[model samples]
Target: GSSGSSGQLLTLKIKCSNQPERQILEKQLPDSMTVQKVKGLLSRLLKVPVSELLLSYESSKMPGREIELENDLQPLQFYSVENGDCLLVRWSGPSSG
Candidate 1:
């Protein structure tokens, strides 16, 4: 796996607030960190299953990329996160999309 450099790494700060508690993850993560990786991390932290989460970036298409989250045009390290990065993760049931 490639670790993006500081300059290449996008700055993304995500905050998720629910009825139980709130969690925040702040880092200069590499653009290579895909939706799947993020889901894994959040599932681990929130103690939930991978099936219970969904993430979407502004540029991403609806029903987002369910496969490998990497974009061919922008390699992970090259895709920088801009300010106010809205990483939306909807945790509903299997029916939710």
Candidate 2:
């Protein structure tokens, strides 16, 4: 990990649905954490179960497939959390719209 100019800690701001939440737990983490780990963290913080979390990303300018966190989630499909990467956790439920 690299230090900043003012020695301020860098964090990731997570956006779920239309709400944004910031967490400052960048340290005390393993060398590499996958997207599944991020989802687990969010579930622990937001009190949501891991089975209710969904991950979506842009693929060729189109909405990629919705990924459900499982024990078999390949590492390549998950993004390695960077120093300043913001993760968005989407909830799986019936939409009112």
Candidate 3:
């Protein structure tokens, strides 16, 4: 029986836009955690608004659209994110004044 212990935690590596280094941040989250939760955590760490952030995975084997804010209810594993996967975190777009 799975008790949802720490063993189920998923560790992911994150990269920021326009960064010289590839690995900027790393987070350990539950497989059942929603993407929205991931963004919230990133918002605090990156000091950016959730609205201004876009998260996606880029790989030669598998590619998909940027995570939709409306799909936040879905678990991170729903996107098939695996350990050691590098998630790209970038600004949505230019802000209008």
Candidate 4:
């Protein structure tokens, strides 16, 4: 273990796909947070509803394709979201907005 239980925290880097100029460089926190909470927090920050807001974390274990934080009630790490993972923010559905 590189960190070896050092702090046991995580850092999220958010990148808005729909809005090219928007992004959150770094948001530090613990691994205890849930995807629902993440969505709710970002919903207000990005000014989008939890249903419309989509979040994808670039995989560290699984390669080729990214992992979607689909389960709202599940923990963030349930989707393998780890420290320094870059989260893709996008609006779901028609994209007519």
lDDT of 2 by residue, 1-97 (tens): 6543532333554456445444323333332445566567767877877667764432332344433334415431343333444445677566565
C-alpha RMSD values across all candidates: 6.5, 7.8, 4.1, 5.2
Candidate 2: which stretches are off by over 4 Å? 1-11, 20-31, 56-72, 76-81, 95-97
Estimate, for each residue in 16-86, the C-alpha lDDT of model 4 and write its tens digit. Answer: 87777864577765576677787888899868898887777888666667766678888776776778678
Model 4 gets an lDDT of 0.75
Tell me the tens digit of each residue's lDDT in model 1 across 9-68: 566655553332556566565565565666777788767666666554543343443233
Task: Give the lDDT of residue 50 in candidate 4.
Answer: 89
Q: Which lDDT value does model 4 have at 35? A: 75
Q: Residue by residue across 34-67, what tens digits does model 3's lDDT show?
A: 8778788879977888777777765425556444
lDDT of each: 0.53, 0.48, 0.70, 0.75
Q: What ordering of candidates by TM-score runs from best to worst? A: 4, 3, 1, 2
Pairs with steric clashes in candidate 3: none
Structural similarity to truth (TM-score) of each candidate: 0.53, 0.45, 0.70, 0.76
Worst 10 residues of 4 by lDDT: 1-10
> Model 1, poorest ten-residue lDDT window?
60-69
* TM value for model 1: 0.53
